[PDB]
Amino acid sequence: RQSWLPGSQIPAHLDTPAAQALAGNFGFDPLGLGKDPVALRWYQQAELIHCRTAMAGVAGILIPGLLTKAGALNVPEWYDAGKVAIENSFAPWGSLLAVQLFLCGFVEAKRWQDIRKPGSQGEPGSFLGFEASLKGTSELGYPGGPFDPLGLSKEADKWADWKLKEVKNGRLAMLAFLGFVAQKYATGAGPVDNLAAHLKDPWHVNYATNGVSLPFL
Amino acid sequence: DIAGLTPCSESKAYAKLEKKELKTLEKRLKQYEADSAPAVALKATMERTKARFANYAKAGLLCGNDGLPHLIADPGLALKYGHAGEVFIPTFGFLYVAGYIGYVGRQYLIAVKGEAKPTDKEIIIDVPLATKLAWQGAGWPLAAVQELQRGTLLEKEENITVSPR
Amino acid sequence: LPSWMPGADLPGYLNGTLPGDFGFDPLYLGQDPVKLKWYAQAELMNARFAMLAVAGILVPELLSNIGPGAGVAWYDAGKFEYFAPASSLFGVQMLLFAWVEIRRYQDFVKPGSANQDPIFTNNKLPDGNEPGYPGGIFDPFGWSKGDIKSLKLKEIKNGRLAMLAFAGFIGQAYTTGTTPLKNLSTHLADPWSTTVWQNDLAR
Amino acid sequence: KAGNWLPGSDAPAWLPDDLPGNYGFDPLSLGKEPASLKRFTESEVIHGRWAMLGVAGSLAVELLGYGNWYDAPLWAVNKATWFGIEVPFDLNALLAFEFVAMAAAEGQRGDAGGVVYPGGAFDPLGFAKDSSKSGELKLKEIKNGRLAMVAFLGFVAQHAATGKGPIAALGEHLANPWGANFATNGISVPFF
Numbered sequence: 120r121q122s123w124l125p126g127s128q129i130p131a132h133l134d135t136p137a138a139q140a141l142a143g144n145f146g147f148d149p150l151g152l153g154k155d156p157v158a159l160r161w162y163q164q165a166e167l168i169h170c171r172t173a174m175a176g177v178a179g180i181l182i183p184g185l186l187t188k189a190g191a192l193n194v195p196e197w198y199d200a201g202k203v204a205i206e207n208s209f210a211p212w213g214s215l216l217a218v219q220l221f222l223c224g225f226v227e228a229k230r231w232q233d234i235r236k237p238g239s240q241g242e243p244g245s246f247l248g249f250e251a252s253l254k255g256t257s258e259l260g261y262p263g264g265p266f267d268p269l270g271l272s273k274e275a276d277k278w279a280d281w282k283l284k285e286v287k288n289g290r291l292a293m294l295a296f297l298g299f300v301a302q303k304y305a306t307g308a309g310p311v312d313n314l315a316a317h318l319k320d321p322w323h324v325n326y327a328t329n330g331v332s333l334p335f336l
Numbered sequence: 337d338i339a340g341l342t343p344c345s346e347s348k349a350y351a352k353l354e355k356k357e358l359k360t361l362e363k364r365l366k367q368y369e370a371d372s373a374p375a376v377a378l379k380a381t382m383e384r385t386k387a388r389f390a391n392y393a394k395a396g397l398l399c400g401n402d403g404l405p406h407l408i409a410d411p412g413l414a415l416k417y418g419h420a421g422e423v424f425i426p427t428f429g430f431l432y433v434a435g436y437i438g439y440v441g442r443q444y445l446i447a448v449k450g451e452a453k454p455t456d457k458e459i460i461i462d463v464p465l466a467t468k469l470a471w472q473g474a475g476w477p478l479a480a481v482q483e484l485q486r487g488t489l490l491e492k493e494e495n496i497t498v499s500p501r
Numbered sequence: 502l503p504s505w506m507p508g509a510d511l512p513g514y515l516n517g518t519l520p521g522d523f524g525f526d527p528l529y530l531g532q533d534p535v536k537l538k539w540y541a542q543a544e545l546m547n548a549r550f551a552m553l554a555v556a557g558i559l560v561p562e563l564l565s566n567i568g569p570g571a572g573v574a575w576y577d578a579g580k581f582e583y584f585a586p587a588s589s590l591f592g593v594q595m596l597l598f599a600w601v602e603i604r605r606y607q608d609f610v611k612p613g614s615a616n617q618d619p620i621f622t623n624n625k626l627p628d629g630n631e632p633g634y635p636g637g638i639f640d641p642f643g644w645s646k647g648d649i650k651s652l653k654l655k656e657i658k659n660g661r662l663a664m665l666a667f668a669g670f671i672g673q674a675y676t677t678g679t680t681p682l683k684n685l686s687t688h689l690a691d692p693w694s695t696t697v698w699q700n701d702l703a704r
Numbered sequence: 705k706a707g708n709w710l711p712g713s714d715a716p717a718w719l720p721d722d723l724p725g726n727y728g729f730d731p732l733s734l735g736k737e738p739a740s741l742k743r744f745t746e747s748e749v750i751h752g753r754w755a756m757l758g759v760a761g762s763l764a765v766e767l768l769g770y771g772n773w774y775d776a777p778l779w780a781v782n783k784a785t786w787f788g789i790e791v792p793f794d795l796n797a798l799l800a801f802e803f804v805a806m807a808a809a810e811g812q813r814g815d816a817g818g819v820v821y822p823g824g825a826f827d828p829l830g831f832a833k834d835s836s837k838s839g840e841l842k843l844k845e846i847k848n849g850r851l852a853m854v855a856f857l858g859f860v861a862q863h864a865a866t867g868k869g870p871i872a873a874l875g876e877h878l879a880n881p882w883g884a885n886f887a888t889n890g891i892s893v894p895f896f
């Protein structure tokens with residue numbers, strides 16, 4: 120099957136019927152972190168959450184960052200947006216961080232207890248009316264009900280394709296955000312400015328010339 | 337600042353010690369030729385001395401009443417006053433590399449106990465298995481907490497004890 | 502069967518059932534039949550909006566060069582008055598196209614389920630549903646005598662040609678900075694000194 | 705069945721036809737389980753009735769010429785009034801009387817098990833003493849309540865955009881329809 124290295128041997132824990140059918144399996148565990156199946160279940164969940172919040176974050180970087188080079192949406196840089204936003208806001212940042220810690224803690228603890236038991240949040244009485252729509256959809260990490268409003272998860276023949284598009288765009292958005300961080304430290308300009316500088320002179324403006332990434336040259 | 341310590345860029349005994357070391361090096365320098373190898377060696381020594389004092393004054397170190405850098409070992413006080421790079425980041429760097437070494441040794445022991453000659457692998461090292469475990473040991477904290485949570489990190493009370501236990 | 506490149510090996514999932522099936526899929530984008538359904542309908546939609554777009558770019562500029570409220574180029578159509586701001590027109594456009602688009606999508610999901618007028622419950626499209634090819638009031642002038650096939654193939658050929666033409670107008674206008682019929686007039690005035698290679702190397 | 709929210713779609717199997725407002729609208733499958741659906745029928749009827757009263761109140765406040773629903777609690781941040789006649793209270797006493805009265809009425813309503821339609825002293829004129837036009841009146845009631853809920857959320861979003869009351873913005877839409885809507889606003893569509 121498909122692998123991250125054609126020719127390397129696939130590890131025995133990623134070549135099982137419980138692992139081959141997950142999403143985006145390419146036999147990539149050179150550190151052997153997923154040998155414990157409970158650990159692989161937990162790491163599947165951590166990967167899905169990092170994928171989804173990395174896509175949402177990198178979209179919040181790029182689409183305001185692309186449209187600010189167009190006409191509308193005078194938006195500051197992402198390493199400057201929190202300061203301008205807290206100058207425009209109504210609350211200090213500590214109060215807003217406390218509110219988001221309570222609001223995220225409730226939701227994350229719901230997801231926590233649904234990881235610990237799959238049939239957990241469907242207790243009758245536990246919720247006013249959201250208790251019957253807070254179960255899973257037989258595959259943990261992929262909930263239904265109020266999550267997924269448009270009903271696209273219902274169709275079974277598209278479903279592995281939807282999963283694999285999600286995991287590829289998510290891993291790619293994780294690389295995008297780590298590149299946003301490193302590009303921010305090495306250059307000091309925005310990522311669209313880095314893309315414009317690589318398009319203006321590709322053979323002279325890259326990470327071999329920034330003087331930071333490999334300083335032995 | 338912390339504990340009545342002045343910053344080293346503000347301390348006067350720090351500059352006095354810098355000037356005293358440059359004075360000793362130039363008193364050793366002034367008895368040679370201009371472009372000779374002892375002169376080049378002492379000028380490189382003076383260059384490293386000036387660079388070291390500039391780097392210590394740059395990093396925000398705290399000097400005392402004698403002009404020497406003092407370190408702060410309290411997580412919250414150093415994270416508050418910007419001294420986290422002297423104990424806190426070094427202690428987590430050390431715990432990473434020390435647990436690396438310990439986890440690679442533990443995996444080598446458990447790998448060689450399952451053979452017909454565990455002692456013979458302890459005297460004569462299985463180099464490919466040692467290099468495989470050495471490369472795989474970069475995810476040692478994750479594997480350590482996973483072996484902790486499964487109960488396979490510990491041996492039970494099948495251990496060796498004395499007659500009064 | 503006509504191929505895009507005679508002698509080449511054609512993909513097995515392309516079988517002449519679609520209008521304009523010439524076997525052209527080198528990137529193998531439509532091996533899934535469900536994706537092929539979505540791509541056939543999207544080809545029809547992009548092609549028909551491209552045909553209306555190329556007509557709406559040609560015909561006002563073709564009439565402005567000869568002997569009417571505005572003779573303005575297509576990319577400067579936003580900076581004109583139109584009795585109202587463009588935002589209100591955007592809102593009206595999005596409401597009415599939300600209606601029409603969601604009704605067409607519900608036809609595509611379940612064929613035979615979006616046919617009759619909901620207000621006037623006797624007006625109705627006939628049972629020859631064919632998602633992408635409605636009929637009825639959408640064919641008022643009594644066409645489809647020549648059966649359906651040749652006109653479908655003419656429709657997809659004019660549509661692919663207009664999609665290429667609109668990709669044209671965007672590219673030519675972004676590079677040369679001018680209007681397309683003036684670009685055609687410069688190519689007809691001296692084609693041997695006005696090529697893409699000439700205008701590229703003129704930079 | 706009251707109709708179909710989307711023609712061509714299928715009716716959900718958990719919604720019965722002897723129930724008012726059953727257009728088959730449940731995409732999220734929220735009321736699939738019967739106890740949840742019973743609680744949601746209760747909540748839908750109560751939200752609809754409170755929204756009818758609230759929309760009629762905001763319309764009467766602005767049509768009778770005493771500010772709008774947004775200008776009404778402004779005296780307490782700064783003297784109450786009603787029909788242009790002063791009311792001699794403050795927000796602490798008003799909050800006390802309102803909390804006692806709503807606690808008593810709500811508690812008497814919540815003592816009953818699943819009573820959506822009480823009748824009795826709540827129905828003095830005896831309209832639902834026939835059980836044939838009563839279901840039609842329930843359907844009229846749930847449609848008017850849904851329309852009033854949509855109207856009140858429209859009031860809130862409309863004032864958060866424009867800063868004006870509903871009747872004044874209705875007059876602005878009747879005056880300049882192509883220059884006063886949610887798009888000359890500059891908020892509902894963030895471009896242009």
Ligand code: CLA
Pocket residue numbers: 291294295296297298299301302305306312313314316317324325326327329332
């Ligand atoms: C997510 C993908 C991604 C993309 C498209 C870019 C693009 C760019 N980077 Mg960034 N960067 C990235 C991730 C990315 N980077 C990561 C993960 C790091 C940390 C290692 C950095 C750290 C970094 C520094 C320090 C600098 C750049 C610079 C640049 C620009 C010049 C090209 C270059 O030398 O790149 C460097 C390339 C890498 C570091 C390796 C890329 C990692 C990916 C995962 C490899 C796989 C790519 C894939 C096969 C094909 C590309 C995908 C694309 C089509 C979407 C270019 C706009 C330079 C700049 O700012 O120019 C003005 C520069 O100085 N990057």
Ligand code: CLA
Pocket residue numbers: 410411412413416
């Ligand atoms: C090894 C033992 C040890 C000792 C003796 C100290 C001593 C101190 N800590 Mg430190 N600290 C330690 C380890 C230690 N720390 C560890 C392991 C952590 C990580 C959890 C911290 C994280 C930390 C933070 C975030 C802060 C301190 C602070 C302090 C100072 C005052 C604390 C106090 O009054 O509460 C009595 C002391 C204890 C109960 C000993 C344990 C300390 C706990 C872990 C934190 C106590 C913080 C305290 C409640 C906040 C006081 C606010 C201050 C403005 C009055 C004091 C010098 C505070 C400071 O910076 O003051 C200038 C402060 O804000 N520490």
Ligand code: CLA
Pocket residue numbers: 248709719723724725726727728729730733734735736741744745746747748751850851853854
């Ligand atoms: C105010 C709360 C409320 C509640 C509790 C209900 C409850 C119900 N509705 Mg009703 N509905 C409402 C308001 C409400 N509705 C409004 C305002 C409208 C007009 C838009 C409708 C239109 C409607 C139709 C056409 C139908 C129903 C039906 C139902 C029943 C089954 C659906 C279900 O199980 O979901 C449970 C419902 C909820 C859990 C509602 C809670 C609100 C969610 C959690 C958030 C919604 C936010 C909202 C989308 C924000 C809009 C902002 C805007 C800018 C987009 C259930 C009794 C079906 C029925 O059989 O009638 C009895 C049916 O066919 N509803």
Ligand code: CLA
Pocket residue numbers: 851854855857858859861862865866873874876877884885886887889892
């Ligand atoms: C209950 C039905 C209803 C009616 C009759 C109105 C009427 C009006 N709205 Mg309001 N509004 C409503 C609901 C309604 N709204 C809802 C649900 C929201 C939240 C999404 C808003 C948020 C809103 C904003 C932000 C603004 C208005 C404005 C206006 C005024 C200008 C026209 C316009 O642009 O509409 C707004 C258009 C929509 C909300 C989209 C249409 C979708 C509707 C709700 C579907 C139902 C309509 C139905 C099919 C036909 C009308 C039924 C009615 C006769 C009972 C006009 C008086 C503007 C204004 O103040 O002008 C000066 C303005 O800026 N509305």
Ligand SMILES: CC1=C[C@H](O)CC(C)(C)[C@H]1/C=C/C(C)=C/C=C/C(C)=C/C=C/C=C(C)/C=C/C=C(C)/C=C/C1=C(C)C[C@H](O)CC1(C)C
Pocket residue numbers: 147148149150151152153169172173174175176177179180196197198199200201292293294296297
């Ligand atoms: C797999 C494996 C396995 C084997 O065994 C081994 C190894 C190899 C080691 C491994 C690997 C690993 C890796 C690579 C990892 C990575 C990760 C990442 C990168 C993540 C990110 C991740 C990322 C993320 C989350 C992110 C997110 C983001 C966000 C939210 C953002 C936000 C924001 C915005 C909007 C803007 C503003 O202004 C600000 C802020 C606030 C800033």
Ligand SMILES: CC1=C[C@H](O)CC(C)(C)[C@H]1/C=C/C(C)=C/C=C/C(C)=C/C=C/C=C(C)/C=C/C=C(C)/C=C/C1=C(C)C[C@H](O)CC1(C)C
Pocket residue numbers: 729730731732733734735751752754755757758759761762772773774776777853854856857
């Ligand atoms: C159905 C369903 C189902 C599926 O499954 C899913 C989904 C879709 C999600 C869902 C939907 C939902 C929705 C839409 C909702 C909405 C709601 C609302 C709107 C409410 C309101 C509601 C509203 C309401 C009650 C309101 C009320 C009001 C009131 C009382 C008012 C009052 C007042 C007045 C007089 C005036 C003064 O001066 C002040 C005040 C005080 C202000």
